[PDB]
Design a protein around this ligand. Structure first.
Ligand SMILES: O=C(O)C[C@H]1C[C@H](c2cccc(Cl)c2)[C@@H](c2ccc(Cl)cc2)N(CC2CC2)C1=O
Length: 125
């Protein structure tokens, strides 16, 4: 949909006590639907990590103006790919135990706990 390719985050990272980087420290490859959203906002790299996928999704919600109200309780969509990975019209932003669980079912990883295979595909500029 869109393209920028003018942003490289090194120190700026997103993490909280609920589900921190200690548990979500796995490499991800470009193929599923979850990482297809951040690939258009501003993420043109070979391979990303599970912790970096949360940073690219948070920047789009702040710049496009998704959550704007006095009493923060629930956010609304504006007819975009945001409601195609989760499959809901409205969701909670401060609830970290509801958004991370959905990201764990629609993605691919390199190192797994059980013996499983997915494929091999890389995209870069
Ligand atoms: O403190 C808070 O409760 C919110 C805070 C942290 C929040 C977050 C951090 C780590 C894991 C998760 Cl799941 C969520 C993070 C965020 C990141 C990604 C999404 Cl999809 C939704 C929210 N944002 C950026 C938001 C647009 C402004 C925050 O402002």
């Amino acid at each position: 949909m869109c393209n920028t390719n003018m942003s490289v985050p090194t120190d700026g990272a997103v993490t909280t006590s609920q589900i921190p980087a200690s548990e979500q420290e796995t490499l991800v490859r470009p193929k599923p639907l979850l990482l297809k959203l951040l690939k258009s906002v501003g993420a043109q790299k070979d391979t990303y990590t599970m912790k970096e996928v949360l940073f690219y999704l948070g920047q789009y919600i702040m710049t496009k103006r998704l959550y704007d109200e006095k009493q923060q309780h629930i956010v609304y969509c504006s007819n975009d790919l945001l409601g195609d990975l989760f499959g809901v019209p409205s969701f909670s932003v401060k609830e970290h135990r509801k958004i991370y669980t959905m990201i764990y079912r629609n993605l691919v990883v390199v190192n797994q706990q059980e013996s499983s295979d997915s494929g091999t595909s890389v995209s870069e500029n």
